[PDB]
Symmetry: C4
Subunit: 395 residues, 4 copies
């Protein structure tokens, strides 16, 4: 399957040359195809205990991931991490929105205020204002079929729901979408992630996120191999047994070692690649992303610790290379920054992610792998071949 | 002939370094000249049984090759492949035009319609319309000398020809061109190629092209090493014994092996180079063109299977490198996209191809080869020397 | 601390490849963090006997360093070298201004002229001119507390000071700044440097600078390994025992050897990098800065001779690389050319240098070093790891 | 002198890597200086029997060298080659102008025509036209002192000279320049070169140039290793024993071998570098200039055959590298294309060449060589050290 004469280079040869590699520094050599692209399985491990249908995860940047993005990202098979450039209460509240989502229901109903509902029974509709009104309600439990029917009868849009005197939640929907890849937890709620620092002060924020029901926590740092992060990992692993923890950014196996001994459930890899902020400029330390993912993933798989290729992704090709090199998932920031669901006053994630999924599936087919797992497997075993490009692209 | 002191690198050394090469990554070292450029023979094998006077072939792109291009390409020593971005009937009809061509005859005579001819005997000329007319005809067999004479007598442009009550075809010509390099089949008809997919649905299209008298068929694919293409090759080789088949794009010897065992008569090489379409974006798989041609040609010649260097050609220099590296012919798309004969509302192929021929001939002379065959031979034997350039061109 | 599996390359491996390196050609791999950035010590040796709190030194260019820059540079922990593109008297006078500085005192009081003071006792204020006046004075010794109080009483700005009939010097200040890193000599005066050529004619200029109390002298040259500079070093070392001498620019250990045997107290490294002048264009000789600093520093430390990385600095990252490679201090020109204190009709050095200090401190923390000395130590011992980038940056 | 610790690379190491080098691909490492730049001797061999004070030669391009350029080039220590993009008579006439030059004398006096002179005795001055006049003359032999004195007396500009009834030639000059480096032949005439093809037809042109007194002839070709050029070299060497011949462009030692066995007195090196013409586009053959000069010069010096580094020169640095690598002289085209003396409707060569001379002299001083000969010698012996740059310049 690999070759007859002289093919290209194995990953152990390529990443052993003398130069650190970038995603654009090489190409993967194609193989044998005996299946259709839609047969390729993209199931990926996000952490030791969390598995997703796709390997896509949105970055915890204030220009990328909030409730909007996380929900969309989760419905299409991935997951989003809520940025922490806000107050602990604000961030915790975004998580809450993600965990309470369910199509057909209004995310946040403006209940009373002294159309909106009364009795934090009545309603303050735009007509009785252009003073409350006796509104009609439906019994808790009603389905979207038993609701979008009751609504069509009385010619309405919203359907205030009641059962014990409080307002639990229904809206327009006459061709609802289906989400077969949706990332959900054991209770059928969408999965959500959130970023946090590693200072004592962050312990209060961690507490709110955990009460809000966050599933994964990523310790946001440009250099995660520190006594501070390690102690924070120990703490969480101790006080929140049901919370998965992804460890601060690292780019070498030596850094990975300390965080793994500490008990991280996953590693975020990258430094020097990806977007930049004035509050965090790049200095002398870093590492080409291709090499980083490979060298860290090679050591991490020894302990069953998944790796997230964070930064530098600009195309599907980049994604498939990151995965082929050992990463279990890929984190994207700027490539998603231009979607509808990204915070701020390329279309919707509902069209884009499916586009990336198809692309990755075609990437796998060209190399002859029926899944991303077979892929990493072909590379570790020396079957997968690559080819280095000269520093003057002409492909 | 090679050198006295220390020359450059042999092809087996150059393409064994550690990086895949592009046409712009190296230069060929000159040799000894004892002949004129016009003495260089460019005869090239397109497939196992088809030989052309020049190694030039036009690409099956809708912005490059249709009847127009194929005819021109064939008259100057090469061949064109009709794209398949159209209906099976349309494509089959383009082939037909190419196979029925003969200078001095109108390609497609608008016979009747109820100047054009009547009796799908008469004529509907622009005068009897500004209502048919009794037109004069000539006996089948008449030459262009016995026709362009009969025409000059009666002061006319077209000469309706008859023999058995139907209209077989003559037009203005008083200094007709001669085509000594013309690519023709055993019956003296111009050679024509056509592209097709590899799905069951394509079997109907293959049938029309074959009935239209196509000589070569290329299985259009970004990655030809698949059970689908292999089965399609087996099928054709079985049902159309007289049809030559060029196998889907490959870039490694391992891919070449499967298609050759299947029975292809030629291989189209390239992936990642050349033009791009939204319907086929480049992902993680591909290979620098220089290396691709060399590695595949080195394995293919073992079985007498010609190789077509497809993609990345921008100059004569590129063409000569592709050939020196082992390719038997070169496929060009965008470089021909700007010629008169290219579909759509740099001049004519009749001026351009002769320009490329002279260029290739001078390329051969500078290295001291009297033919493209001697060339590939000097490279395989280690006589031909090359020189690698640093990734910061300064030549 | 270095790594568990396969890290990157040691400095002895990286700078032993086959190519000379630039600061942008590689990255430093991060390590283990168990301290805060503000704990990092940046103490650096400028020469054998001069030590500064920061490793920053301004370049002797007429668009960069004069009295202004040198004072500012010295108050923030570094030092400046006064350019020599002026007369010996002018340059000597700039040094004098630097050595006589003390906050709260007017650098240069325009004493008389026949508000300014009289008696090279009285005053020519803008009122008695819009003719001298009997002005009030204060006893020598008075503090800024006993002065800025006497001033607030009589509602004035300047406070002419007297003791022996001459005017010694006070001005507005009600929130004076403190400078804990200030570079001062044994007498508590700010340290100052100055550039000079190596021709006999320069002996007169050296004499004025020394009488003006200069602490360090740098022999300005594009290629310092010459009998002229060597003889000039011998001369100074002989006639001015208390003057430190930095030797002309060199880029190889062989050049360094001659100047060290001659007795230089420090070496200025660089050639081909940094700004350019028509009066000194770059020819065929030079050396990539990264390699230059490393190779010269490796030989110089054997004799306790500090090295100044001169040229090519554009960012903090560049500074930290220069230091990690063996340089004791770094010389900056164009990066400071845009500050307020730079000669000519990015803000003040008082904001910028502190910005660089913090940056270097963070650079050290990321690699796990509590000081620049530990840093160079980790690199010489093989603990510090680097990673080479391909000539097509993608980080 | 070379180094103490680990310097850079010797030329035999650098040009033995695996890549062909360009002038911008490396730098020369500086050495020890114990002399002034004005002490550097630039004497260079143009061919086996022609020596010049400078190693500069102008290219035989129609936009660069004609009578004008050749004279100027010769007066400043170099030589020019007259292009052949003209008729044999025209080219021969340009040579004649160069050979007959002597300051103080009018190059081409418009003698009669039926101010100009009469008697192909009289004069047709602008006054007797705004009809000839009896003009006064001077005896042959008169000096510029005995002429520019006779002229100042009669208040005139031109001084018709006579001796045997014909007009031999004097003009304004009251501060004539001196040319200590002037390239002159055994008869004190300025040296001149001229280009010619290698076809039989060129034999007539060679004859005119030789009768015109040309000193050197260069066989203009993009690839000189041919039976045609070889036979032309044999012919000239046979029929014009006193004419020096420079052989067609080559870039390998193997090509050099044939032309040397044939008897060339010098080799013009280059292919792929330098200016381009539509009538001669670059194809697949060529070689980076740095490597070309080194590899050909290394073989040529074995037989005492000088080498001309032709093409790619853009700066003094390029010139000094070409010479250090083994070339005896350097040919410049476009760098001189913008001077006053270049044909067509940066100033004069009289200011520019002296500028290049000083630059080369400084180049030599920085490496510690008192002459270009010592230079090539330091490189062949392994003393001269170089340093390769990564394909992403940062110096
Ligand atoms: O996908 P792109 O935008 O290339 O990279 C996004 C990744 O960039 C990094 N990043 C974003 N803003 C930053 C400010 N400072 C440092 N890193 C940042 C983060 O590591 C993040 O997950
Ligand atoms: O000669 P150029 O234009 O560089 O390359 C033409 C070759 O480019 C490829 N090509 C053209 N349109 C394409 C869309 N998607 C993928 N490949 C395309 C084909 O392989 C074709 O024969
Ligand atoms: O910090 P940058 O501006 O890159 O480099 C400043 C250094 O540039 C060099 N330099 C400045 N003007 C010059 C004219 N000629 C040659 N070198 C110059 C000096 O070595 C100086 O200390
Ligand atoms: O000094 P530059 O302009 O780079 O190179 C001048 C050299 O360029 C080459 N040259 C000029 N016009 C040309 C047309 N076609 C091929 N080579 C040319 C010649 O070899 C000439 O001596």
């Amino acid at each position: 399957t690999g070759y007859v004469p002289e093919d290209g280079l194995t990953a152990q040869q390529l990443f052993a040359s003398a130069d650190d590699l970038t995603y654009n520094d090489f190409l993967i050599l194609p193989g044998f195809i005996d299946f259709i692209a839609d047969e390729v399985d993209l199931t990926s491990a996000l952490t030791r205990k969390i598995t997703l249908k796709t390997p896509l995860i949105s970055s915890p940047m204030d220009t990328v991931t909030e409730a909007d993005m996380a929900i969309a990202m989760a419905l299409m098979g991935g997951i989003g991490f809520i940025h922490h450039n806000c107050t602990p209460e604000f961030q915790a509240n975004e998580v809450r929105k993600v965990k309470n989502f369910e199509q057909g229901f209004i995310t946040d109903p403006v209940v009373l205020s002294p159309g909106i509902p009364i009795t934090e029974v009545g309603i303050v509709t735009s007509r009785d204002i252009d003073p409350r009104i006796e509104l009609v309600v439906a019994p808790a439990g009603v389905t979207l079929k038993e609701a979008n029917e009751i609504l069509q009868r009385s010619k309405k849009g919203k359907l205030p729901i009641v059962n014990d005197c409080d307002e639990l939640v229904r809206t327009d929907l006459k061709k609802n979408r289906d989400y077969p890849l949706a990332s959900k937890d054991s209770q059928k709620q969408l999965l959500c992630g959130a970023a946090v620092g590693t200072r004592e002060d962050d312990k209060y924020r961690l507490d709110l996120l955990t009460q809000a029901g966050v599933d994964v926590i990523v310790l946001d740092s440009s250099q995660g191999n520190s006594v501070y992060q390690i102690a924070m990992v120990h703490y969480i692993k101790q006080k929140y047994p049901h919370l998965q923890v992804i460890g601060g950014n690292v780019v070498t196996a030596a850094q990975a070692k300390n965080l793994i001994d500490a008990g991280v459930d996953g590693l975020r890899v990258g430094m020097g690649c990806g977007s930049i902020c004035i509050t965090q400029e790049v200095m002398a330390c870093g590492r080409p992303q291709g090499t980083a993912v490979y060298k860290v993933a090679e050591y991490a798989r020894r302990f069953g610790v998944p790796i997230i290729a964070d930064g530098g992704i600009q195309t599907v090709g980049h994604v498939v290379k990151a995965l082929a090199l050992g990463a279990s998932t890929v984190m994207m920031g700027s490539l998603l920054a231009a979607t509808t669901e990204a915070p701020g006053e390329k279309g919707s994630i509902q069209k884009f992610v499916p586009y990336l999924i198809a692309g990755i599936q075609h990437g796998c087919q060209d190399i002859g792998a029926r899944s991303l797992s077979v892929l990493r497997s072909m590379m570790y075993s020396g079957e997968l071949k690559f080819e280095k490009r000269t520093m003057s692209a002409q492909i």
